[PDB]
Subunit: 599 residues, 3 copies
């Protein structure tokens, strides 16, 4: 009767108004409320205890309402909650329960997706405090946490950290901590305007799978000297990665502390992304302390087709150990990336490198087990003034890394600082197809292009090929006497080297070793016997006991004689060859030779 | 009057309740039903004949209801049907009509997209039977089938095959058979828990275009010995591909039968994906029998930037013929992939390879027309115990394949089994920039690193470069007498070769051919005349009629004389050079030479 | 009372019918209209002035209705307007206001996304006229335009240009002109059936950021001889790109005028896409005239992992200047692409090339500043008949370009037409790892594989390596006398060269320069003195004053003597070496040597 009017204006009203899709007689006879129940938004929970809707804004703490939404949808097996466009939804307090320990604001739950179309902002309650905006753990102790599965965050919206600085270096801040996370992702979202430790973390100590970050943007997420460290996406579960993202920082501190991506477990990737203003591109590291979920090996690591302007190192390789676990890194590919060091003074940020073999956190360089790394088809450029730029800074033990078909245009090709660490190196392979650029030509006074400041080098190949002159460099490659060298191949192509005083330098005459295979140019003075006809020439110096053959790199300006085209040696360390005196007489010549040993 | 109450509670109720968007006076005056009619879900068709909604579950066959939805939406020009989250929708019977012949469950229709947010499960009715869950053909005979256009399946949902094994090897099972499919795709879906032939097939015998699989997951889709074969996504129309997917198998049988992707037509790709537990990565094959829609050539084939742990072959190249059509494969690129053979006993699965040139289905090796393949910037690794691992197993005729700047770390570089097929090889190019790894060092007793077990080799380049010692190997490269060799270049760099008895071996002295260009190290015994002064040395053996020049790779321990630095030959097959006797006397020496022919 | 009935049938009806999500007592007590207000479609504005809905179709101009939708949603802070599936929405007039100057139809507005599920078609009103379907400028003068931010167009729908030809060459036509566009994108849309200048343009004269085109299709967008030019996506703001798109043309005119992508600002990319039927793949060019928003440098340019069949040039590099600005292009990577020239007569379209260094629009070749380009791991193929095919056509000044590990199979490796431009070349690097294919073998009568038709060449490397014979070619590499050559390395590997009359040719004897490093094969006639024993041989010609060493590439058919293995030279330009007469007598021989200078 008039009871009907009352029902209709009541909350159950829509449950009494019939609907059948497109008047189709074969369709289900439903009620309007049933169709509206097919979707869900924050508006459906953003109300006071009387059920009246509350408008969001800077004086409203939306946290409890969003939590209620997620908890309720979780209760029905999942779904997608929309965070509506055209509004900014402020968060103003910590969550409670299991996420309390993680300084969590919102607890994510399995199968409950968030479609963020509007903006989520942190209120000043969080200034100078830690926070983790979305947390997937359900326990304060991550080891007793259940899992988070099938949770996807996506949309055109924004998460804005409100510009608040850290209160103390020891604090952590995150956007999305997925936890022990399986089939979770973040797509399309802009994370901005903060001072945080990470924007997103996938996995927890190897527990997790199939977590991805795609088409997101990360903008100005470090802003203070208080911030101890930053990796925008931290990939800590296997079969997981970052694809087609954009990362930008503009603070000075970001140039010293910030890394775009950290890959910490097997079968992870970082691809198709653009970085600007960061210290570092990617960490690729097996931390023993994070090896509980997916084992002790980081393998199948891929960094590909990225574009970066950074201030420190592009890719940092590592592994370490704990009292009970030893970490290992292997089967890595770095390819297709175009990377430059941004304009900066020499030494004004961490040492510029395409690849860095870094020591562990405690600075130890003798714990690493890094091998089967392929670095291929990349471009790297540093401005000419940046003394501290290298294709590779090899500062810790290396068990293998292979470079093929790259283009490196920076100050050093291989570098480690002297005095410092003395890395044990095996299976360092520098193929002849690496092109060494000319930007730093004339800047290398006192310096060695490949500065082999290592404890030892074995089973390695360095094939140096210049593509322009740099007569400022001390040598193309130098081994100090402290570096053992064995079962290696070291060659310097003669092109652009004719005027170099030193090409390859072995300060402990390591090139004499039984299984060292070398070649490089040198200038040699020779004197002949006086005999007319076929006549020997002999080097005046006796430094060539290790030489198997040598050949001329100089023309013969003489008519009446010619020096030998090719030389061998003698037991006293002289070179000897057979030339020709048309007319007799003692000859004396200075010739550029290619010295060869076992090659 | 009270007629109004009745209208409102009726199915037409919502068609009588007015709505205007946001009270905007300029907006359309509509009825609620009009706005609800903008979307459509399974709920709108999942009802009994009285229009009452039916709850899904393991005792409800949702098939007819989903079919009705698709048929109805098809009738209005298309749209997107949501399969709601928070529910599992069981399928319990075969479809009828044109898809009956394809063992179809559901018939897809043009412009009707499915947004799968919940789960679709197969009921036990399908145990031991064939099925194809979604079928795009409209006729039992595919040749008389109409097309499927603009059909997209996407969402966060799941298709679960219920774990049922095949009933017989001859049965086929599929998830999505798109048919003659144009502008169709599958995005975001998890396919799991089955024993099937394929998860998705795109195209039919070259008919189709612009079909894609992106961000899907494929998990445990082979589970029995009954399963004859499996390719997770079968790409059988052009301008189509797979991108950023995840594939995983855990059964033993998958290691022997399962391939992640099959590319069978032109302008197809497979990229950015991760594979674990499969026998094979990708087939790239032009089957003559499937050449009706897009011609007889598979060209523009791309496999790039994938990550794989497999048990057999990463990329399998092929082509075959029928009585009226000859298949051809050309213009292929395989690049950026990092691939390893998983831990397994030698010979316990199909022979491990990065690239396999396979014979056709009937085993024929003389029908293939494969050329212009570029294999570049890949990494490959097999554990040291896996005897049956090769960069390339070349088991059928090859008309060209080019390898540049890869890193191969496995047992063989080039291999084919002896006795077996005798492939005719042209335009095999192995650039010097391929890095040969050391994992298998010391495992190669009795074996040849490049084992050229072919009928003939022409217009080919093998430039061998070691980066560590392996003195266990019989030779770096060996050609049996049965292999003709012409118009080729074969070189073995001397590095790490000084102690090798055999470097390159030509069992029929094929290196003597007019247009063979070779170089490799050998040890040679020489004896000099007694003359004081310039004095010839001559090899004691007469095996060097083919040598154009040789040079020393050994130092000269003597003071009183030196052997020649360089040698040529004589008509009787001796080497001859001019050295120097400071003091006269017959000299006799054993020297490591680099033997050179026309290089 | 009966007033209630009236309210309910009124437009405010739904605002009086209560709803609470899933009967959840903790949910907001809302009205149906509130839930319907969460989404918005064209239907909500596609009405007459009385509020009655209008059906779209070929006689209805939907433009004003769509504009009203966008303007209204803009007014509320944004949202997403759906263009419904199952309908075609015709556009039939120009927009008004700021977009009038841009021949705009619809004005886009910030934060207002369009989800296009149905089809948008142009009505014949636009035949022979300019148009820009969606425009993001808000002023006729782009320089006084505000920005467009956070505008995304996406869905499964279509934009169809109605097949109308241009009315005049000077007209412009576009699909989406985003304007000064920040965080804008287009995803999933099919653009088809037109004669336009561009489908999408991102940015305006460097103003914009983070604009992307992904998973779109572009089909048959040039159709007349009237069309002056076409670039399907024009990327004119930084941090922007195209990914995973499909481009196809079928008209003849497209083969001559159409380019798939133009990258015109820094930190832009083009990846994962497939092209067929176009003249050109991508422009990578810094236009001085478009350098207002993001500076004068195009750097971090990436073209990767694309598949193309084109008729002209794959990647075109450029830079130019204006009276006040000089453009610069640097830090470019082209990698992983597989590209072929489609079947066509020689010279029937613009000259086929993988890379083209093009002159500016006015044809000037002396304004360019292009450097630090890496071209690596690509494949290129042209059919044997296409005389006009080159790895690189270098037609303008070049300051650096590096080629590593590619596979080029076309007519020329390096080419520029003689007579024409005389490019100044620096830092051209052609690594030995580039594989030169054999398709054009026997087609090269009168031609030079590397035809160095330049003003000068400095700091360059050309390492030629053949992998099959082509005895038709005039030379492997030729420098005309007009080309200066200095501080370079030029080498021709001897493999497959034994029968070549000319290998490297220096028409002005440029190989004699102080800092030229060269090697190549030649045939040389020698004569010996009659002396028994060690005996000199001397070349009969005096053309070898520049030779530092030479070595034999021929066997010695003689028993009674041997020519020298190795040679040096003399001041008169003869070669000289020491061989051996077992028996005395004057010897005369023709030998294939490897001539070497400073290498
Ligand atoms: Na040491
Ligand atoms: Na044979
Ligand atoms: Na000149």
């Amino acid at each position: 009767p008039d009871q009907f009017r009352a029902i209709i204006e009541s909350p159950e009203g829509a449950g009494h108004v019939g609907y059948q899709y497109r008047r189709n007689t074969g369709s289900t006879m439903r009620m309007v409320s049933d169709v509206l129940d097919e979707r869900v938004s924050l508006w459906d929970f953003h109300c006071d205890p009387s059920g009246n809707v509350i408008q969001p804004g800077p004086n409203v703490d939306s946290r409890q309402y969003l939590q209620a939404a997620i908890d309720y949808v979780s209760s029905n097996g999942g779904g997608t909650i929309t965070i509506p466009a055209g509004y900014t939804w402020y968060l103003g307090s910590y969550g409670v329960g299991g996420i309390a320990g993680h300084s969590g604001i919102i607890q994510l739950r399995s199968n409950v997706n968030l479609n963020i179309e509007g903006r989520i902002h942190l209120s000043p309650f969080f200034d100078l405090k830690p926070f983790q905006v979305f947390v997937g753990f359900d326990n304060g102790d991550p080891a007793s946490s259940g899992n988070l599965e099938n949770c996807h965050i996506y949309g055109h919206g924004v998460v804005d950290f409100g510009g608040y600085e850290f209160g103390a270096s020891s604090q952590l801040r995150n956007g999305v901590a997925f936890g022990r996370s399986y089939n979770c992702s973040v797509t399309g979202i802009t994370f901005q305007n903060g001072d945080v430790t990470w924007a997103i973390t996938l996995g927890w100590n190897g527990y997790g799978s199939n977590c991805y970050v795609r088409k997101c943007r990360f903008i100005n997420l470090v802003n203070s000297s208080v911030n101890a460290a930053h990796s925008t996406v931290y990939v800590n579960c296997p079969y997981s990665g970052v694809e087609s993202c954009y990362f930008s920082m503009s603070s000075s501190f970001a140039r010293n502390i910030a890394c775009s991506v950290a890959l910490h477990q097997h079968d992870t990737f970082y691809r198709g992304s653009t970085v600007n203003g960061y210290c570092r591109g990617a960490y690729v590291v097996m931390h023993a302390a994070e090896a509980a979920g997916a084992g002790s090996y980081a393998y199948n690591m891929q960094v590909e087709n990225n574009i970066a302007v950074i201030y420190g190192q592009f890719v940092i390789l590592g592994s370490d150990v704990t009292a009970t676990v030893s970490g290992h890194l292997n089967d890595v590919i770095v390819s297709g990336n175009i990377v430059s060091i941004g304009e900066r003074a020499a030494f004004s940020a961490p040492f510029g490198a395409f690849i860095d073999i870094g020591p562990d956190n405690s600075g130890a360089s003798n714990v690493q087990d890094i091998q089967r790394v392929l670095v291929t088809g990349n471009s790297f450029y540093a401005p000419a003034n940046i003394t501290d730029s290298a294709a590779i800074t090899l500062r810790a033990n290396l068990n293998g890394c292979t470079f093929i078909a790259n283009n490196f245009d920076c100050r050093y090709m291989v570098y480690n600082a002297p005095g410092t660490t003395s890395p044990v190196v095996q299976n360092l392979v520098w193929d002849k197809s690496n092109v060494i650029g000319g930007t730093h030509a004339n800047q290398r006074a006192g310096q060695n292009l490949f500065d082999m400041q290592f404890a030892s080098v074995v089973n390695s190949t360095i094939e140096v090929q210049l593509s322009c002159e740099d007569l400022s460099m001390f040598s193309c490659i130098l081994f100090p006497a402290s570096c053992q060298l064995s079962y290696s191949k070291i060659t310097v192509d003669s092109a652009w080297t004719k005027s170099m005083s030193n090409t390859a330098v072995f300060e402990g005459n390591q090139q004499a070793g039984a299984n060292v295979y070398v070649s490089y140019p040198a200038t040699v003075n020779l004197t002949s016997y006086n005999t007319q006809g076929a006549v020997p020439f002999f080097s005046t110096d006796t430094n060539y006991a290790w030489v198997t053959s040598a050949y001329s790199l100089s023309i013969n300006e003489n008519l009446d004689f010619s020096p030998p085209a090719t030389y061998t040696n003698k037991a006293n360390g002289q070179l000897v060859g057979v030339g020709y005196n048309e007319i007799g007489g003692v000859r004396s010549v200075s010739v550029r030779l290619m010295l060869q040993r076992q090659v």
